[PDB]
Amino acid sequence: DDDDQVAFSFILDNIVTQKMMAVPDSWPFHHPVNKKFVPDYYKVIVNPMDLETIRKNISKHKYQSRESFLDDVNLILANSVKYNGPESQYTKTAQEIVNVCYQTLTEYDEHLTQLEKDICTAKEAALEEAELESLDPMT
């Protein structure tokens, strides 16, 4: 909710919508799998992920780092490797989603490096204030 977290999330959301979702034939990854359409999916995938869920997470500011966002991006790929196989066209398409994620992030490397540091400085200051305000039981 701070300016820096809002700017960080703004970059992640644009990478998802403008770049990752534009990969050709990426539609299997745009939304959660519906068991009515893929009956055995959740018998095999125990940690499902998709781009819409990532966008809901970005909206809630779940990610304060590239690494945490990229953990969920990578889950999409890993799940396709498990469910479809490493050589499936599903998995080739997932791989391209991940590649264009990494490539687009690199175009923002300096600014995202700074934003991650500034988010973490502000979180730490706010944590230390909240700890001190509780510890004195006066107010």
Residues in the site for ligand 67B, rule: CB under 6 A? 28-29, 31, 33-34, 37-38, 80, 83-84, 90
Shortest Å distance, C-beta 33 to ligand 67B: 4
User: Tokens for 85?
Assistant: 């196989």
* Between 3 and 133, CB nearer to Ca ion: 133
Residue nearest to Ca ion according to CB distances in the complex? 139
Shortest Å distance, C-beta 121 to Ca ion: 23
d(CA 59, CA 17): 13
Q: Between residue 104 and residue 133, which ones bind Ca ion under the rule CB under 5 A? A: 133
Interaction between residue 139 and Ca ion (CB under 5 A): yes
Q: What is the DSSP string of 87-139?
A: TSHHHHHHHHHHHHHHHHHHTTHHHHHHHHHHHHHHHHHHHHHHHHHHHS---
On the CB side of 47, CA atoms within 13 Å amount to 11
Q: Which residues contact 135 (CB under 8 A, 6 or more apart)?
A: none
Shortest Å distance, C-beta 133 to Ca ion: 5
* Between 18 and 34, CB nearer to ligand 67B: 34
Residue 136 binding target from Ca ion, ligand 67B, none, CB below 5 to 8 Å by type: Ca ion
Amino acid at 97: I
Footprint of Ca ion on this chain (CB under 5 A)?
A: 133, 136, 139
